[PDB]
Ligand binder design. Sequence first.
Ligand SMILES: [Mg+2]
Ligand SMILES: [Mg+2]
Ligand SMILES: [Mg+2]
Lengths: 52, 59, 148, 114
Amino acid sequence: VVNTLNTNLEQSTSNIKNVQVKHLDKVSVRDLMLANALLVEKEVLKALEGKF
Amino acid sequence: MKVKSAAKKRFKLTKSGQIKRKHAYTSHLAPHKTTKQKRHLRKQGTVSASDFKRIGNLI
Amino acid sequence: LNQLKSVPKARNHKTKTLGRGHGSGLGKTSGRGQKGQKARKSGLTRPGFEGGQTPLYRRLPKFGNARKGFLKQEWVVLNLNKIAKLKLDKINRASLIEKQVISAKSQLPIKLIGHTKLEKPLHFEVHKVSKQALKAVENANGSVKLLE
Amino acid sequence: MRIKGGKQTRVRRKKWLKQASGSFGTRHASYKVAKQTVIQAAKYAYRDRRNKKRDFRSLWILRLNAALREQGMTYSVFINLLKKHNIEINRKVLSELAIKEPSKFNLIVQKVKS
RNA sequence: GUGUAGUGGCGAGCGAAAGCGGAACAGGCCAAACUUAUCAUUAGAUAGGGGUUGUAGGGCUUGCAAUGUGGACUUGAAAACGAUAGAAGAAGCUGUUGGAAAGCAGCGCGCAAAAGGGUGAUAGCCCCGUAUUUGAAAUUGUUUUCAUACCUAGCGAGAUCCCUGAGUAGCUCGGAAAACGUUAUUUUGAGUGAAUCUGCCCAGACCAUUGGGUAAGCCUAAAUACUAAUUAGUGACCGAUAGCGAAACAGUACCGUGAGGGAAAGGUGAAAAGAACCCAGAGAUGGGAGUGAAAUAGAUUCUGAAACCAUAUGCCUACAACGUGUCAGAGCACAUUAAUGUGUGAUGGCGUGCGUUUUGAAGUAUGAGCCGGCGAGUUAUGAUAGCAAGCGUUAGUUAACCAGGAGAUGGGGAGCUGUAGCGAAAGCGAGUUUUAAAAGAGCGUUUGUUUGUUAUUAUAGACCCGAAACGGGUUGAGCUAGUC
RNA sequence: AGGGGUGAAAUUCCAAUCGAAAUCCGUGAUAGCUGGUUCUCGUCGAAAUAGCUUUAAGGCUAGCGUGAGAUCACAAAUAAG
RNA sequence: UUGUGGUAGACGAGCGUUGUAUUGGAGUUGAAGUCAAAGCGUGAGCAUUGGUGGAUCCAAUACAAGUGAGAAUGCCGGCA
RNA sequence: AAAUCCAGGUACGGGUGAAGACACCCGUUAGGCGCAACGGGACGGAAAGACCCCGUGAAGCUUUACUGUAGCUUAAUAUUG
Ligand SMILES: [Mg+2]
Ligand SMILES: [Mg+2]
Ligand SMILES: [Mg+2]
């Protein structure tokens, strides 16, 4: 999950079927609970707290 | 559904069910009915439980 | 919820399959009975019908409509039984829209109503008040202003 | 999706056919007749499961009366001499089988003469 | 808004216009006066300038201020992005099973390229491609810029001056469109027929007041409907009785004089390496041989079930009244999903099918010759009730639409249900209707909403199939009837 | 050339079919009338009556079944008085 | 302890099919489809081995239905 | 070839039965299987009875049934002095 949607990472990881990068507002319940492993980035914690 | 046009003009729907209705036998002939009948039929009443279901789903 | 296994608490009810053998019930007849009119396709005759006999709604005389072709002029009503729960003074249009009791895109006369006692004084400018509603709101040492 | 369902029908009719073997004619070939024959055979089995315990009792009665008539008394008299006095709970299958190994059932018929 | 106001043998039914929230947004141009020119100028006609209307405007006289912004707009020139062909385009060996490795195992590598297809069995690294970067001699599309036509331009004072769409608006008699079944509004077949800014029309008969708008002339892109066609792609779409009727030389074969009707059918193999040669037979062909991993893959060509037909191991059957089985039951022959085993059954007791519809069917009621396949309670939008979930006491909740990978979802509070009801209604209000009555009686003095699922129901063909018919359009006097 | 034609008239003929051709369309016409409607087990389990009906082979309500909930005692059955 | 027949019918609990999404797994040492057999369940059903066949398939949880066939003088095909 | 056919290994008398039995109950007779015959029966086959009745079915026809209408006729009105 990401906020700025960097292009170096998005350009990478495209051919890797397991991984996927999504914006903070692009993730759904299924797209999250299916991961079984995720890497939240630093700031979206505050935004998620605000949105609750 | 389209509400039955010939129903909403005879059945004022009151609070908490209990569809109200006028009484019949009040439009044509006066002398054949006594004053007791005449001054009872002017008041209005509800619909019995038999036809209540068939009228409620019609409205 | 471990998508490999997800469950609800209780929502899966018996589905009445109509043409699926006598073992489950609902055999050849699918629950239509036996050889009636309902049993035939497109049965279940018109909702208001009593088999030729004059139906109930046709017997009774019609309610009249004195004011014919007109819509009863609607009123927005403040019942004092609940306005106390709405903590606010100087009740008016400029405030009720903030509390979302009414909407900005609405030019409608405001009416006051109710018999319940109220503790803290309030202030209204509305178009109509009930007699004893006015008495009650005045007894609370409030006030009311009558807009035409 | 569209469903054809070939395996299930074949398996079901195969089971019904297999239930009936040794049947005459086409009864063991056509499922439509095999199912009816299986129904009738099972009805007959249900009836005979009671008929056989209804009948073996009579068979024991007969093969006991035949033995008793060789000693000088009838079956009806025998039960009283069992029930009313010299009380016993000897079943009619063994009070009949014991004759097949004699010199021990004669002990029964003489004991009741007391 | 809403199944609302209303319309309806007030029956079946039918169903707005406002208002609100959104998609889109551009308004211009003639006739008429006035005037120029030309018409035997009897113009009553033609071609110019002027004017295009409601906080009425335009013309007439006299001034002021402007040289512009804009087009639903002409020519070229320039730029840009495309469309119609393409080019480059990474990375692997060994071993084993095997006919074949790409499988699996061991050790590596590439990735802006783990889409796909092929390659002797399932390959990110064998090949074509893919991501990505680039490519137009010629035709052609769209947008932008420049100049360039054509059109387009504001504000004063005077003055009973003139113009503002005539067989027109209305009105009568018949019809119709509007949700209206003839009703204000609109329309017209016949007739009749005005007014001119102090005007005319309109605010569901009609009149007055108030207010709104200026008909009887014309044009106008965007939101809109559709996909036979082209390109790319997708599918909890079909997979050879399915899917278009048509996977194949299908509207063909075939039927009908004609309109018209209208099918069935696919798969060897890895690659023909399609079986040289020998025997039999006239030959087809079969048996060998050979190729092949496999010839019980051989052209009848993947898999090969049942109905049906044959042949055989074991048991029984030619004094027998049999819906054919069942419970007992020897004898005989074997050995299994090891099981108080299997196969057959001399003989005993008992024994009138399956579905339909019926008060009652073995029925001398009805349907099925058998086998295989296909074959009938669904969906859209609503309402009701049950169960469960979310949010909850000024609650709950979005619709269309926009953004988002033809996603969840965010924005969108327009509305909807509840919060107060009673009354035909004005109205009143925890009361209200009736009533002279505050008596009495009736109704009320609180339980929610949005969903998911189930059941029922309404309009849709609404479980399946089955009529004789009805109405419209076409083809048929080659047979037959009449006539020439 | 078809709610037409033809008829020394019979309801004859109009492509083997005519009390009104054949074919296509509205069309999946309607059918209170037949027949059909497919997997299993468990619990409960009737009616063929009343009234009305251009109703009598049908329908509505009531009667009888079933599921959920309430009333347990004053309700309902069973004997005796 | 009371029971456990049952048509119309009312309610509950389940089996099976094809596909989808998550995990897991098997497969030229032979998957599915097919036949055979003296297997196992209360029932829809589910295994085990062998022959054939040669490339996909199975298990667990949910979702979705063109989802279950003996009858319609049913259609089609084949054979009596 | 053909229509037909629920599966058949398909006796007679008395009685019973949905009211006339190859299959039922009680008796009697009958070795297995053909071929040529002849039609008593299998309420034998073909034809969802053509008679009769029901359907708030169809079509055709009739009339002083109802509602309309083509046509014919009369008047007013425009063409119309
Ligand atoms: Mg059935
Ligand atoms: Mg039936
Ligand atoms: Mg006959």
